[PDB]
Write a protein that binds this ligand. Structure first.
Ligand code: HEM
Ligand SMILES: CSc1ccc2c(c1)N(CC[C@H]1CCCCN1C)c1ccccc1S2
Ligand SMILES: CSc1ccc2c(c1)N(CC[C@H]1CCCCN1C)c1ccccc1S2
Ligand SMILES: [Zn+2]
Ligand SMILES: [Zn+2]
Ligand SMILES: [Zn+2]
Length: 452
């Protein structure tokens, strides 16, 4: 028995209440099943984990150097190419985060830089989005190339702008056209234009990787992910089965920027917004900051386990902000069943994470901003199983530990040194997002006033 069935996230909400948690659609020329609520998402991605970890093919990635051992991680098919890069990135992130604690130090320094760029606005109103973008990009640059960029660096601005444009290309009529029917990529006028900006983004990274190649000291342990990768590539010369090759290096690095920039930055943008709309919550986080850390010392990760309210608030920013509502598509390898219905092999799965984060049977007030969603009456932090902003299963976000570190360190450092407020004489910003692959706060401005 197949599932029933006839911007986007609201239409899927209505379709849920019509046909239920597991329903069918036939978009482009593609069979889709949408999954709603914890139980269907969990059943598909965990219980049937082994047969839902594949990605729908994407013909136009042909343009970006994709091949059987050059698929990067994000859109790579389930198989050894995916699995080798997934293990590499996971363990590289673990290693860089242990011993010397390099990632934590890079994030701590970027938070200091980010506070200074906030101070220099001197209590005049401003949109914080651009600065959040830069801070979070520098964390990726640190992870992947072992450097940061000055916030006024022109190359950095260029890399950022190209990245923003190349996210737009991910959601295009054009893009879906050649993707859905790929034989029109023989026409050079079409092919050259779909991923114009992504190619330029990739060209700018190539330039950075070339520089990094020159300064790499292979006589020392790798100090960042690209070095670790380059070391593996050397061991793999003469092995055509390896995914450690120059064509894949640039896709892996570009996947890490693509997946880890706008998500983390947009989440922080939600957090500041929710802090000026809910100044009472802001002050109570500032209370816990002062009482656990002080107004002087830089926040460290070891603080987080003693700050259940700030942890609650950050979790609630993620749940309410709901920045990846329809997740990232999967594809079924074998046939499976979910909530009774049968799902044939080759079906594109859409995981409706928003329906998990906003399930009315799980959360007390799913459409309000409410830190007590993660607090018990004693004030202990609790994390409900429906907290899945990173999805679940084999393909669940590999950057989650770095994002948790970034959200806590950037968010607490900022509220440690500033008070945020709607600027006098402007409308209360809306708390409704704008969907465009990611859900972002409506554009808003704020005042950052130092606290000492
Ligand atoms: C709040 C911040 C973030 C959120 C909400 C987020 C969310 C997600 C989601 C929903 C997925 C889809 C998982 C699926 O296929 O079901 C994903 C995958 C992924 N994310 Fe994140 N992400 C965040 C930050 C990051 C960071 C900082 C990095 C890199 C350092 C990163 C790298 C990746 C990669 C490489 C994948 C694909 C994993 C795979 O296909 O094996 N993300 N993320
Ligand atoms: C600024 S280019 C950009 C920005 C944000 C995202 C993505 C691309 N990608 C694909 C990553 C791509 C990067 C170029 C090399 C090949 N790989 C696969 C993506 C795909 C599907 C859902 C979400 C996302 S997040
Ligand atoms: C890749 S990660 C990701 C995460 C959420 C969505 C999408 C992709 N897609 C692809 C759905 C796809 C199914 C097969 C036929 C063509 N259609 C678009 C999408 C694209 C544009 C608007 C909304 C959405 S929902
Ligand atoms: Zn390096
Ligand atoms: Zn308790
Ligand atoms: Zn200060």
């Amino acid at each position: 028995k197949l599932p029933p069935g006839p911007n986007t996230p609201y239409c899927f909400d209505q379709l849920r209440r019509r046909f239920g948690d597991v329903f069918s659609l036939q978009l482009a020329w593609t069979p889709v099943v949408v999954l709603n609520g914890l139980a269907a998402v969990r059943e598909a991605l965990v219980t049937h984990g082994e047969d839902t970890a594949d990605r729908p093919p994407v013909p136009i990635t042909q343009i970006l150097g994709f091949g059987p051992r050059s698929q990067g991680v994000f859109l790579a098919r389930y198989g050894p190419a995916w699995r080798e890069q997934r293990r590499f990135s996971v363990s590289t992130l673990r290693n860089l985060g242990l011993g010397k604690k390099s990632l934590e130090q890079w994030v701590t320094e970027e938070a200091a830089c980010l506070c200074a760029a906030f101070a220099n606005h001197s209590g005049r109103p401003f949109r914080p989005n651009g600065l959040l973008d830069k801070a979070v990009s520098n964390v990726i640059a640190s992870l992947t190339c072992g450097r940061r960029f000055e916030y006024d660096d022109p190359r950095f601005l260029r890399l950022l702008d190209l990245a923003q444009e190349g996210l737009k290309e991910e959601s295009g009529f054009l893009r879906e056209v050649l993707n859905a029917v790929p034989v029109l990529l023989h026409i050079p006028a079409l092919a050259g234009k779909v991923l114009r900006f992504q190619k330029a983004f990739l060209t700018q990274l190539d330039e950075l990787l070339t520089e990094h190649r020159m300064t790499w000291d292979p006589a020392q342990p790798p100090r960042d992910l690209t070095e670790a990768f380059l070391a593996e590539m050397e061991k793999a010369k003469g092995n055509p089965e390896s995914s450690f090759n120059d064509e894949n290096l640039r896709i892996v690095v570009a996947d890490l920027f693509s997946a880890g920039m706008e998500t983390t930055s947009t989440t922080l943008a939600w957090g500041l917004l929710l802090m000026i709309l809910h100044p009472d919550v802001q002050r109570r986080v500032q209370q816990e900051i002062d009482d656990v850390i002080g107004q002087v010392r830089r926040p460290e990760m070891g603080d987080q386990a003693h700050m259940p309210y700030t942890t609650a608030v950050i979790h609630e920013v993620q749940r309410f902000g709901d920045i990846v509502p329809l997740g990232v598509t999967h594809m079924t390898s074998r046939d499976i069943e979910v909530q009774g219905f049968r799902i044939p092999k080759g079906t594109t799965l859409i995981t409706n994470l928003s329906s998990v984060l906003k399930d009315e049977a799980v959360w007390e007030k799913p459409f309000r901003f409410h830190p007590e969603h993660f607090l018990d009456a004693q004030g202990h932090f609790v994390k409900p199983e429906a907290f899945l902003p990173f999805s679940a299963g084999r393909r669940a976000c590999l950057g989650e530990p770095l994002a948790r570190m970034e959200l806590f360190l950037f968010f607490t450092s900022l509220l440690q040194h500033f008070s945020f407020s709607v600027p006098t004489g402007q409308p209360r910003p809306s708390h409704h997002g704008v969907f465009a692959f990611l859900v972002s706060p409506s554009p808003y401005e704020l005042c950052a006033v130092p606290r000492h």
